[PDB]
Design a protein around this ligand. Structure first.
Ligand SMILES: *[C@@H]1O[C@H](CO)[C@@H](O[C@@H]2O[C@H](CO)[C@@H](O)[C@H](O)[C@H]2NC(C)=O)[C@H](O)[C@H]1NC(C)=O
Ligand SMILES: *[C@@H]1O[C@H](CO)[C@@H](O[C@@H]2O[C@H](CO)[C@@H](O)[C@H](O)[C@H]2NC(C)=O)[C@H](O)[C@H]1NC(C)=O
Ligand SMILES: [Cu+2]
Ligand SMILES: [Cu+2]
Length: 496
C-alpha cells in the first residue's frame, strides 16, 4: 500500500496488538509496520527517517530488505556492522536499490541487535505483471497478505535473553492468556473466488504450524522463488520465511479458524490464542467454532520443487563444487559459536573494512567469523544440527542470494536434480545435515546467520565475504552511506 518510493518514519509509541499496552516501535506512526509494494524490476527508494528517542529499544536503526539480492547495492542490505553503520536518531538515510529478476513476497525489518522484535518489521510484496501463477487466482492485494509474529509484554532488552512469547499476532492482532477478549484478525473471502494469500513470518523466534480449518492450501511460492503448485493441509513456517498459497474459497459460507501454532510458549488454541478468523462474505460476525482435523498431508520441504525444476549448482555428488564448507555449531560462555567463533559486531562494518583495503578473511573482523568466497563459483555449505546449539531447530538466512536446499531437515536424501530454492532454511534437529548450494554471482559481504534474533544477538552468525577483489568496483556507495559511520561513532552510548 506504500512504495516503491516512500518515506518510512521510525518513532516510538504505545501499542496494544493483544489488548496489553506497551511501548514499541512505530513506522509511519502505525503498528504493525505498513505493507510496502512494488513491481518486478522496480527501483525502490525508501527514505528511513529515524525519530526514535528510546535507548532501551535503541535509538539508532538499520533496515534489511529481506530476500532482495541487492546486486551492486550491498551497502543497502541493512545488517548493522556488516553492510552499514546504523542510521542515527534525528537523521535520515535513503535506501535506493533495484529488484531486477525478483518477484514474490518479502519483508523488511530492523537489522540492528534484536530491535525488530520491538516492532520494526513489515511485509513487502513485489508483484509480477507476468506472474506465471497469475491464472490460479482472482484476488491478490493488500488484504491477502498474512503476517505471523511473536509478541512479548516486556521489550527485547527488558525481559529474559531468550523470552517466551505472550501472544502470536496474525496481521498484528492476537490474544494472550490474560487478554482472551482481545480482537482477532479477520481475513475475508467471497465464496467462488480464489485467493493468493502471501504468508510471511516476521517472527523473532518461534516457527508456526499454520493451517486453516476446512481448507487446503496450494503452495506456489517459497521465499520469493516460484514453485510447482503443491497442495497441503498444513505447513510449518520458520522465522523470516514466506509462502504464497492459493486458497479456493469453495467451502460452505461460514467462519473458519486460521491457526498458527508456535513451537514454544502457549501451544494450544484455548480461548482463541494463536488464531485468526477466515470469514466468508455473508457469515455471522462471530468466532469460528470449527474443529481442527489431523494434518495428513503437511508440507514437506524436500517434496517442494521450483517451477522451472532448476538443478542445484554444481555436480550431483557431495563436495561437487568449487568450495565446500561445513558450519559446526556450538555454545560456550553464553555465546553461540560457528566453527569455534562467536560473531561480535565489529566497530568498522565489514563492507567498509573491504573498501578500506582489507584483502582476506584473515584481515577481516571479527576474526574467525568471516569466510572469503571465490568469484563466479559454486558453493556448498552444510549446517549439521546439534544439541550443542540449544533452541533448535535454528533457521539460517543467507543474504544476497537464493540457495538450493539439496538436503532438508527431516530427510536423509540429497536432491541435486530439482531441489527447492529459497533463502531461509531450517537446520532442523540433531542428526539432520541440512545442506545448501549457491552461486557466487554477487560481490560483497553477506550475512549467513540464525534468524532467531535472540541467538544472532548471542553471536550465531558468519559473514560470507564474496569476491573481495571486486566488492568496491561492484558496489559504489552513495555519500550518505559514507556519512553513516562518523555520525554514529560520534554518538554517546546512551544515544545509540
Ligand atoms: C522505552 O522502552 C522500554 C521498553 O519498551 C519501556 O520499558 C518499560 O519500562 C517500564 C518502567 O520500568 C516497565 O514497567 C515496562 O514493563 C517496560 N516496557 C516494556 C515493553 O518492556 C520504557 O518505558 C520506554 N521509555 C519511555 C520513556 O517510554
Ligand atoms: C554434514 O555434511 C558435511 C558435508 O558432507 C560432512 O562434512 C564432510 O565430512 C566428510 C567425512 O568426514 C569429510 O571427508 C569432508 O571433508 C567433510 N566436508 C566438509 C566440507 O567439511 C559432515 O561430516 C556432516 N555432518 C554430519 C553430522 O553428518
Ligand atoms: Cu531477515
Ligand atoms: Cu540477517
Amino acid at each position: 500500500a506504500i512504495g516503491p518510493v516512500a518515506d518510512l518514519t521510525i518513532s516510538n509509541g504505545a501499542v496494544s496488538p493483544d489488548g496489553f499496552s506497551r511501548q514499541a516501535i512505530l513506522v509511519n506512526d502505525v503498528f504493525p509496520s505498513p505493507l510496502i509494494t512494488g513491481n518486478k524490476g522496480d527501483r525502490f527508494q525508501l527514505n528511513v527517517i529515524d525519530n526514535m528517542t528510546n535507548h532501551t529499544m535503541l535509538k539508532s536503526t538499520s533496515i534489511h530488505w529481506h530476500g532482495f539480492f541487492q546486486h551492486g547495492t550491498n551497502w543497502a542490505d541493512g545488517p548493522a556492522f556488516v553492510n552499514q553503520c546504523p542510521i542515527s536518531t534525528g537523521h535520515a538515510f535513503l535506501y535506493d536499490f533495484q529488484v531486477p529478476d525478483q518477484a514474490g513476497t518479502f519483508w523488511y525489518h530492523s537489522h540492528l541487535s534484536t530491535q525488530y522484535c520491538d516492532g520494526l518489521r513489515g511485509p513487502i510484496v513485489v508483484y509480477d505483471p507476468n506472474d506465471p501463477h497469475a491464472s490460479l487466482y482472482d484476488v491478490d492485494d493488500d488484504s491477502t497478505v498474512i503476517t505471523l509474529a511473536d509478541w512479548y509484554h516486556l521489550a527485547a532488552k527488558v525481559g529474559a535473553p531468550v523470552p517466551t512469547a505472550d501472544a502470536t499476532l496474525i496481521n498484528g492482532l492476537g490474544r494472550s492468556a490474560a487478554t482472551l477478549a482481545a480482537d482477532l484478525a479477520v481475513i475475508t473471502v467471497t465464496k467462488g473466488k480464489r485467493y493468493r494469500f502471501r504468508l510471511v513470518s516476521l517472527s523473532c523466534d518461534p516457527n508456526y504450524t499454520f493451517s486453516i480449518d476446512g481448507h487446503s492450501l496450494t503452495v506456489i511460492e517459497a521465499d520469493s522463488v516460484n514453485l510447482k503448485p503443491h497442495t497441503v493441509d498444513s505447513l510449518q513456517i520458520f522465522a523470516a520465511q514466506r509462502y504464497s498459497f492459493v486458497l479456493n474459497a469453495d467451502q460452505d459460507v461460514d467462519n473458519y479458524w486460521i491457526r498458527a501454532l508456535p513451537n514454544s510458549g502457549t501451544q494450544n488454541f484455548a480461548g482463541g490464542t494463536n488464531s485468526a478468523i477466515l470469514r466468508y462474505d455473508g457469515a455471522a460476525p462471530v468466532e469460528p467454532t470449527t474443529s481442527q482435523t489431523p494434518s495428513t498431508n503437511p508440507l514437506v520441504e524436500s517434496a517442494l520443487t521450483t517451477l522451472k525444476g532448476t538443478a542445484a549448482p554444481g555436480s550431483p555428488t557431495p563436495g561437487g563444487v568449487d568450495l565446500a564448507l561445513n558450519m559446526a555449531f556450538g555454545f560456550a560462555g553464553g555465546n553461540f559459536t560457528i566453527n569455534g567463533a562467536s560473531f561480535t559486531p565489529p566497530t568498522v562494518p565489514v563492507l567498509l573494512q573491504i573498501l578500506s583495503g582489507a584483502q582476506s578473511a584473515a584481515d577481516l573482523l571479527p576474526a574467525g567469523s568471516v569466510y572469503s568466497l571465490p568469484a563466479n563459483a559454486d558453493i556448498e555449505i552444510s549446517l549439521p544440527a546439534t544439541a550443542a546449539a540449544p533452541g533448535f531447530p535454528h533457521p539460517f538466512h543467507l543474504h544476497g542470494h537464493v540457495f538450493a536446499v539439496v538436503r532438508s531437515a527431516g530427510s536423509s536424501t540429497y536432491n541435486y536434480a530439482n531441489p527447492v530454492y529459497r533463502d531461509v532454511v531450517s537446520t532442523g534437529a540433531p542428526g539432520d545435515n541440512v545442506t545448501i548450494r549457491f552461486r557466487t554471482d554477487n560481490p560483497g559481504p553477506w550475512f549467513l546467520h540464525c534468524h532467531i534474533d535472540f541467538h544472532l544477538e548471542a553471536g550465531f552468525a558468519v559473514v560470507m565475504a564474496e569476491d573481495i577483489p571486486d566488492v568496491a568496483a561492484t558496489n559504489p556507495v552513495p555519500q550518505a552511506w559514507s556519512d553513516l559511520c562518523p555520525t554514529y561513532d560520534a554518538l554517546s552510548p546512551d544515544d545509540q
